[PDB]
Amino acid sequence: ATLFIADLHLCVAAPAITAGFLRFLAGEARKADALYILGDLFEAWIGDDDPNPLHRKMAAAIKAVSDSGVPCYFIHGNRDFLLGKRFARESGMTLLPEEKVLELYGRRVLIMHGDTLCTDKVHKPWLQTLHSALPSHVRKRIAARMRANSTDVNQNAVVSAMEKHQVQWLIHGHTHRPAVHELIANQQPAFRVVLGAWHTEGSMVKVTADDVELIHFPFL
């Protein structure tokens, strides 16, 4: 089984969530084929080496999952888009681009945080370099945050991303509204599975060869 979670918004002031995440990593995650964390794992992020005991503890708990044989992957959210390679190495996670297609048990599945779907130069390299100065997953987040500091997902964006990636399944979070949506893409049926935030209960998408399901579980 391949597991997907997001929107934990971990912080020192919310230790029950952190405890529930540790239980998850030490139990369910150990039995998975892989674990995908689709952004907003932390409420905020600046420096990979910030003095934060919470960061050290989470990195070691995640690294203990991957060390046990369960690969771990991370797609940045709008809260933790500065999380970098150093922390990925500390935690044993692979960082993924803002949109990624997986081949899960014969099916193509698009994963992303979901904020780039909203829910509120190229020809010349020397010129292109200037635009790609920061990784795309940082450039778009920084621009949106700056605009929002100065002053539901868009359906056209959903379709457009599923036709661009030739995909009938999409998993994301960000909106904090867990649900399963049906739609049309690529002249076929398509589905968009939305994760929930961990403010009061955990949630995951569990994908197997036979089933996908959106599951909620208490922190215990």
Which residues from 53-112 bind Mn ion, rule CB under 5 A?
Answer: 77-78
Residue 98's binding partner among Cl ion, Mn ion, none (Cβ under 5 to 8 angstroms by kind) is: none
118 DSSP assignment: B
Query: Which residues bind to Cl ion, rule: CB under 5 A?
Result: 78
Find out whether 176 is annotated in a ligand binding site.
Answer: yes
Helices (H), ranges, 70-216 = 85-91, 125-131, 136-150, 155-164
Residue 40's binding partner among Mn ion, Cl ion, none (Cβ under 5 to 8 angstroms by kind) is: Mn ion
Nearest approach in angstroms of CB 138 to Cl ion is 13
Residue 156, number of CB atoms within 10 A of its CB: 10
The burial of 50, by beta-carbon neighbours within 10 Å (0-12 exposed, 13-18 middle, 19 or more buried), is given as exposed
Residue 202's binding partner among Cl ion, Mn ion, none (Cβ under 5 to 8 angstroms by kind) is: none
Instruction: Assess 40 for contact with Mn ion (CB under 5 A).
Output: yes
126-144 residues labelled b (16+ CB within 10 A) or e (exposed): eeeeeeeeeeebeebbeeb
Instruction: Name the residue nearer to Cl ion (CB basis): 85 or 145.
Output: 145
3 DSSP assignment: E
Instruction: Assess 178 for contact with Mn ion (CB under 5 A).
Output: no
Tokens, residue 81: 């888009």
Residue 7's binding partner among Cl ion, Mn ion, none (Cβ under 5 to 8 angstroms by kind) is: Mn ion
DSSP SS3 for 107: strand
Nearest approach in angstroms of CB 45 to Cl ion is 11
Name the residues that contact Mn ion, by CB under 5 A: 7, 40, 77-78, 115, 174
Binding site members: 7, 9, 40, 78-79, 113, 150, 174, 176
